[PDB]
Structure 1
Amino acid sequence: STLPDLAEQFAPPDVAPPLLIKLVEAIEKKGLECSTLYRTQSSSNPAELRQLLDCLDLEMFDVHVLADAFKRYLLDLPNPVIPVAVSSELISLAPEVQSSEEYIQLLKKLIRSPSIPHQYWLTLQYLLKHFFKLSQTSSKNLLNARVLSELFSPLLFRFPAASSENTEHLIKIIEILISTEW
């Protein structure tokens, strides 16, 4: 709620918000092989999770609380990781643009826009690297790139839009961007 804009939480040469780095690193240390990571609700309500995003070493918390605070963080950003300026344009694309490569090309062009601080694209890259690392231990945590896209795309885009071949295309590019991180 009081979470500052991504552009105010860090700046190059740093690669991601320091709070998001703590969350991701704690979650990867404690939950990389957890087969319900990001798929089960913890006991804590949003007000308790928000308390966590201010105050301690995060490795001290239950991994399912960290996973919920991670989702809480993405929801409480004043503007989503993928700004609506970008989402609005991607949703407007015609059926004749069928190439996932084209959607990805446009996402990168728009999000790298000078009207959008570089921090947004940097944060997304950091998240994609996290999702890719999780998908590499899928034999144990059961997380592939597509499931991760379906779980987190609504948090990254924060867009209420009726499910179309457009919304399916947003989910698909996130899927592709996770798979092709390395």
Structure 2
Amino acid sequence: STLPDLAEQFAPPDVAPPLLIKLVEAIEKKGLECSTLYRTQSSSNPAELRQLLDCLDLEMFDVHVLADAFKRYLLDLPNPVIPVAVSSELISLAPEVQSSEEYIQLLKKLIESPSIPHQYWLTLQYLLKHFFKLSQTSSKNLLNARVLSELFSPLLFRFPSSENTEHLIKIIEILISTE
């Protein structure tokens, strides 16, 4: 697993990692209306998917393989899209905080910290925009913000169930809806 850090894959003024852009654009070209997108088991194994995340046009691949490589990419980032410091803070507040708007404002403040490269928040925004675009054909693909949040929150936060973890999933659900 040689996937570089998000901060090593691109820098401002680019808006997202180029590999993630290739994946997302190919998936939206081929899979926007697919009623099992991102919910189907992997026909390929991790080693083969990793091969794909090095090398040529991603439209040539089966869309269910692209969706798996997308998941593989989020799992192989050496640090997750939402860093563990951020997750740890949000989780340790949950008995005491319940306001979703407060968690959301705090997620933005934590992830835009000077100690965290801006690439992390830029990537999260690119992901949220993808997830939101999927949710606009949810009558066909069955992916609304809530389902997208249950699928991807564990890959974004990198967590394997309290009222806490539920609060993280709800944050992502609201963040997808309000784009």
Secondary structure of 1:166 counterpart:
helix
Give the Cα–Cα distance (whole angstroms) in 2 for the partners of residues 73 and 38 of structure 1. Answer: 13
CA contact (8 A) 2:94 2:163 kept: no
Equivalent residues of 2:82, 2:124 under 8 A apart: yes
In structure 2, the residue matched to 1:180 is 178
Task: Give 1:34's aligned residue.
Answer: 34
Q: Distance in 1 between matches of 2:33 and 2:74?
A: 22
Deviation, 1:94, is: 4.1
2:102 is matched with: 102
Structure 2 Cα separation of the partners of residues 166 and 85 of structure 1: 15
8 Å contact 1:112–1:121 — kept in the other structure? yes
**In the TM superposition, what whole-angstrom CA distance separates every residue of 1:17-59 from its partner, at most 9, and x where no partner exists?**
0000000000000000000000001310000000000001000
Q: Work out whether residues 153 and 171 of structure 1, in 8 Å CA contact, stay in contact via their aligned partners in 2.
A: yes
Distance 1:108 1:44, change over 3 A: same
Q: 8 Å contact 1:84–1:159 — kept in the other structure?
A: no
- RMSD (Å), alpha carbons: 0.7
Matched pairs, number:
179
* Partner Cα separation in structure 2 for residue 159 and residue 109 of structure 1: 21
Contact 1:74 1:81 in 2 (8 A): yes
Q: TM-score normalised to the size of structure 2?
A: 0.99
Deviation for aligned residue 1:96: 3.3
| Structure 2, unaligned runs of 5 or more | none
**Alpha-carbon offset, residue 126 of structure 1:** 0.2
1:84-115 deviation per Cα after TM superposition (whole angstroms, max 9, x unaligned): 01000000004231100010011001000000
Equivalent residue runs for 1:132-151 within 5 Å: 132-151=132-151
Unaligned runs of 5+ in 1: none
Residues 84 and 157 in structure 2, CA contact (< 8 A), matched pair in contact too: yes
Distance 1:41 1:94, change over 3 A: closer
- 8 Å CA contact retained: 1:128, 1:177: yes
Assess if the C-alpha contact under 8 Å between 2:80 and 2:156 holds in 1: yes
Larger mean CA deviation between 40-49 and 90-99 belongs to 90-99
The CA distance in 1 between the partners of 2:54 and 2:109, in whole Å, is 34
